[PDB]
Write an enzyme that holds these catalytic residues in place. Structure first.
Site, PDB file in Angstrom:
ATOM      1  N   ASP A  35       0.784  -1.236   0.000  1.00 27.76           N
ATOM      2  CA  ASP A  35       0.000   0.000   0.000  1.00 27.76           C
ATOM      3  C   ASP A  35       0.822   1.296   0.000  1.00 27.76           C
ATOM      4  O   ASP A  35       1.367   1.685   1.028  1.00 27.76           O
ATOM      5  CB  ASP A  35      -0.929  -0.017   1.225  1.00 27.76           C
ATOM      6  CG  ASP A  35      -2.026   1.028   1.161  1.00 27.76           C
ATOM      7  OD1 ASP A  35      -1.767   2.147   0.706  1.00 27.76           O
ATOM      8  OD2 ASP A  35      -3.155   0.738   1.587  1.00 27.76           O
ATOM      9  N   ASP A 225      -1.832   5.702  -5.262  1.00 32.89           N
ATOM     10  CA  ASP A 225      -2.030   4.690  -4.238  1.00 32.89           C
ATOM     11  C   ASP A 225      -2.397   3.297  -4.732  1.00 32.89           C
ATOM     12  O   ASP A 225      -3.502   3.054  -5.202  1.00 32.89           O
ATOM     13  CB  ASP A 225      -3.072   5.206  -3.254  1.00 32.89           C
ATOM     14  CG  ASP A 225      -3.538   4.158  -2.296  1.00 32.89           C
ATOM     15  OD1 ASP A 225      -2.721   3.310  -1.886  1.00 32.89           O
ATOM     16  OD2 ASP A 225      -4.733   4.195  -1.940  1.00 32.89           O
TER      17      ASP A 225
HETATM   18  N1  LIG Z   1      -6.194   4.188   1.366  1.00 31.45           N
HETATM   19  C1  LIG Z   1      -4.955   3.644   1.456  1.00 31.45           C
HETATM   20  N2  LIG Z   1      -4.004   3.894   0.577  1.00 31.45           N
HETATM   21  N3  LIG Z   1      -4.625   2.804   2.460  1.00 31.45           N
HETATM   22  C2  LIG Z   1      -5.449   2.406   3.474  1.00 31.45           C
HETATM   23  O1  LIG Z   1      -6.646   2.777   3.609  1.00 31.45           O
HETATM   24  C3  LIG Z   1      -4.801   1.416   4.472  1.00 31.45           C
HETATM   25  N4  LIG Z   1      -5.855   1.059   5.487  1.00 31.45           N
HETATM   26  C4  LIG Z   1      -6.070   1.643   6.847  1.00 31.45           C
HETATM   27  C5  LIG Z   1      -5.284   2.674   7.508  1.00 31.45           C
HETATM   28  C6  LIG Z   1      -5.858   3.936   7.916  1.00 31.45           C
HETATM   29  C7  LIG Z   1      -5.029   4.926   8.569  1.00 31.45           C
HETATM   30  C8  LIG Z   1      -3.622   4.653   8.796  1.00 31.45           C
HETATM   31  C9  LIG Z   1      -3.061   3.391   8.384  1.00 31.45           C
HETATM   32  C10 LIG Z   1      -3.893   2.415   7.737  1.00 31.45           C
HETATM   33  C11 LIG Z   1      -7.148   1.012   7.382  1.00 31.45           C
HETATM   34  C12 LIG Z   1      -7.672   0.022   6.432  1.00 31.45           C
HETATM   35  C13 LIG Z   1      -6.915   0.026   5.290  1.00 31.45           C
HETATM   36  C14 LIG Z   1      -7.113  -0.874   4.091  1.00 31.45           C
HETATM   37  C15 LIG Z   1      -7.176  -2.307   4.308  1.00 31.45           C
HETATM   38  C16 LIG Z   1      -7.340  -3.197   3.201  1.00 31.45           C
HETATM   39  C17 LIG Z   1      -7.451  -2.706   1.866  1.00 31.45           C
HETATM   40  C18 LIG Z   1      -7.395  -1.289   1.614  1.00 31.45           C
HETATM   41  C19 LIG Z   1      -7.233  -0.379   2.714  1.00 31.45           C
END
Ligand SMILES: N=C(N)NC(=O)Cn1c(-c2ccccc2)ccc1-c1ccccc1
Length: 364
Positions: A35, A225
């Protein structure tokens, strides 16, 4: 060996791309979502309904507690954990092992996905947005600091019973594998080091300029992203886009559920690709009034689900150049030179091709 790193990512369509990693001693095997839109190395560390495998601090002789928790809520779920540190490796990446911070997830809300196959997440963005604050050094930062792998990584996202189609790709860490792309690499500056923020100066829904004040394309911000599937656009640009797309594909008609991204449209191999136009995103270049375009085909924004889903959606966080945009392009995250390069991918019909063309001559 760049070579050893080729094809080191796997995924289920629309559910991300992961890379195998190991944590602890003995090495615990886990698939980790790559990510570039987050900055924490967080992995499941407790049993979960979607988890068939997780991190067990208990079995690691090299695990270290930090005694300091981390609560991360978001509109829909959250992930809570205990912060720690342990040895981490990437089997099909550089031959190194570094000690990195690890957020051991013990409680989650719609975090993990059913049947995705990844057990954690590798936040590759900067400390600015790391949880709980910017004092928790992100994984890549520890990698470069300890080992002496160069501050740069590339991603070649490729794309494509019943099951979601499987996707493949490569994450080349520490350099640029020239066989992953053809043509030249065009770089757009990283506006600021938190998210991998860039600037879109103009947009086209095939030759036609959307003709908006460029501040709109980046209303709020624009990011690259890999952790996001769709190309997300600011409400105003989004509606301008669909309109243009609907006008060009009109020799064909579909419902609103389709354009609202919450509905599929199927044809077998008869698929009318050519009614749908190409989307050109011009990105600010390295020279002030210089820009360059990346052109994407419908094969890119029409994600397979034969059936497909419209992979373009609205946003209030700004523009998000997700997987569907990175696919067919070899993307270089040159952290050392503070920029992002784009080049047509080895990954990637006979009338149109995804492209990276330049150059062209107050947006943020
Ligand atoms: N939007 C992003 N680039 N990254 C996220 O949201 C990471 N993220 C987070 C996240 C939110 C704030 C700080 C660090 C991680 C929560 C859930 C996800 C996630 C999980 C599975 C698939 C996609 C997202």
């Amino acid at each position: 060996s760049f070579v050893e790193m080729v094809d080191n990512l796997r995924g289920k369509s629309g559910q991300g791309y992961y890379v195998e990693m190991t944590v602890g001693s003995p090495p615990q095997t886990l698939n980790i979502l790559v990510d570039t839109g987050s900055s924490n190395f967080a992995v499941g560390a407790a049993p979960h309904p979607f988890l068939h495998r997780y991190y067990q601090r208990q079995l690691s002789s090299t695990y270290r507690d930090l005694r300091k928790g981390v609560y991360v809520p978001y509109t829909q779920g959250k992930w809570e954990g205990e912060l720690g540190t342990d040895l981490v490796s990437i089997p099909h990446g550089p031959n190194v092992t570094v000690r990195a911070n690890i957020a051991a997830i013990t409680e989650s809300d719609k975090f993990f996905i059913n049947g995705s196959n990844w057990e954690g997440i590798l936040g590759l963005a900067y400390a600015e947005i790391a949880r709980p604050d910017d004092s928790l050094e992100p994984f890549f930062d520890s990698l470069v600091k300890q080992t002496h792998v160069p501050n740069l990584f590339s991603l070649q996202l490729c794309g494509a019973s019943e099951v979601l189609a499987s996707v493949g790709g490569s994450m080349i860490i520490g350099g640029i594998d020239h066989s992953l792309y053809t043509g030249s690499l065009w770089y757009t500056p990283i506006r600021r080091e938190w998210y991998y923020e860039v600037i879109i100066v103009r947009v086209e829904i095939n030759g036609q300029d959307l003709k908006m004040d460029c501040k709109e394309y980046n209303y709020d911000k624009s990011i690259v992203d890999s952790g996001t599937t769709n190309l997300r656009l600011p409400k105003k640009v989004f509606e301008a886009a669909v309109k243009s797309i609907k006008a060009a594909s009109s020799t064909e008609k579909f419902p609103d559920g389709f354009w609202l991204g919450e509905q599929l449209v199927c044809w077998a191999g008869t698929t009318p690709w050519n009614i749908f136009p190409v989307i050109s995103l011009y990105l600010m270049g390295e020279v002030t009034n210089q820009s360059f375009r990346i052109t994407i085909l419908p094969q890119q924004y029409l994600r397979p689900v034969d059936c497909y889903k419209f992979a373009i959606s609205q946003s209030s966080t700004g523009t998000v150049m997700g997987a569907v945009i990175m696919e067919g392009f070899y993307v270089v995250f040159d952290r050392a030179r503070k920029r992002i390069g784009f080049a047509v991918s080895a990954c990637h019909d006979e009338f149109r091709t995804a492209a990276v063309e330049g150059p062209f001559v107050d947006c943020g």
